Amino acid sequence: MVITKIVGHIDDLSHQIKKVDWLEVEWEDLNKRILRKETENGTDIAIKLENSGTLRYGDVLYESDDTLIAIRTKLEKVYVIKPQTMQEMGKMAFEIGNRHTMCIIEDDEILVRYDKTLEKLIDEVGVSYEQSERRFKEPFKYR
Amino acid sequence: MVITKIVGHIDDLSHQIKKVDWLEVEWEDLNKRILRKETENGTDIAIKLENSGTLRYGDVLYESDDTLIAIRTKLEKVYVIKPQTMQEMGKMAFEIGNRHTMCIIEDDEILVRYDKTLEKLIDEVGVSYEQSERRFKEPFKYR
Numbered sequence: 001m002v003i004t005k006i007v008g009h010i011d012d013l014s015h016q017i018k019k020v021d022w023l024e025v026e027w028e029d030l031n032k033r034i035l036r037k038e039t040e041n042g043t044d045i046a047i048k049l050e051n052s053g054t055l056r057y058g059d060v061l062y063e064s065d066d067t068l069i070a071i072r073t074k075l076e077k078v079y080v081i082k083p084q085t086m087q088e089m090g091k092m093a094f095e096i097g098n099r100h101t102m103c104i105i106e107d108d109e110i111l112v113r114y115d116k117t118l119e120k121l122i123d124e125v126g127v128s129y130e131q132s133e134r135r136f137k138e139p140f141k142y143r
Numbered sequence: 144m145v146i147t148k149i150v151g152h153i154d155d156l157s158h159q160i161k162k163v164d165w166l167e168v169e170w171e172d173l174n175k176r177i178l179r180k181e182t183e184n185g186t187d188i189a190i191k192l193e194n195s196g197t198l199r200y201g202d203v204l205y206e207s208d209d210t211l212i213a214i215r216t217k218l219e220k221v222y223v224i225k226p227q228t229m230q231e232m233g234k235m236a237f238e239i240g241n242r243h244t245m246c247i248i249e250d251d252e253i254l255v256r257y258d259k260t261l262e263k264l265i266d267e268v269g270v271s272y273e274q275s276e277r278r279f280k281e282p283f284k285y286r
């Protein structure tokens with residue numbers, strides 16, 4: 001199936017009444033305009049967005065009576081850094097930036113891919129963190 | 144006057160009853176152990192700390208009946224970046240770190256030396272900021 005335009009967006013997964021056949025992509029695939037991969041259920045998808053569109057987490061690519069094909073990034077090993085203060089957030093975020101390490105700052109959490117070499121640094125800053133599995137839902141803006 | 148050990152520390156300037164003859168130093172001079180400079184009133188000071196001491200903002204070097212010689216960093220042109228949320232703080236701090244720009248994150252503010260080239264970046268992140276004059280009171284930890 002060739003997709004040239006997004007046909008919807010999942011704002012709330014719990015309200016979805018159709019089965020979702022996810023097209024799992026990499027974090028790096030967000031904001032992209034071209035992609036070809038098979039969905040979980042094996043449907044071949046060739047994305048070539050026209051206009052100025054850019055793939056977003058939750059974007060709906062196709063919808064049938066009982067199924068929806070939508071985009072989500074893969075579940076991966078990460079560190080969920082949780083600063084308790086504005087000062088902790090600023091100092092921790094600064095150190096991650098200084099190391100040029102990609103991350104997503106959502107609300108009061110700092111999400112980065114699992115890398116043990118960061119442990120000494122996070123402890124050094126003295127911020128609470130844990131290893132877990134998460135999906136990166138926002139494109140990393142290489143500013 | 145040769146100083147080999149700190150003799151006190153100004154915890155609260157308003158409670159000081161003696162006149163203070165400040166030894167104004169550079170931000171980079173903090174945490175240092177050796178320094179030679181004249182105080183505002185012209186007193187020659189040669190600092191050569193023994194032990195493991197490191198010059199701190201507010202450190203008292205000498206005290207007479209009516210005067211105190213103490214350390215403070217100079218008043219300089221800066222940007223006082225003020226994120227309103229944890230997310231703003233994290234994203235702004237990250238970008239400053241990614242540029243390897245020295246700063247001090249105190250409470251909910253990000254203090255950096257004035258550099259117009261940062262304006263586009265701060266606006267890009269969309270955080271409120273202002274140009275002003277401040278003293279850096281904590282050593283920059285080159286981690």
Ligand SMILES: [Zn+2]
Nearest residue numbers: 098100241243
């Ligand atoms: Zn670099």
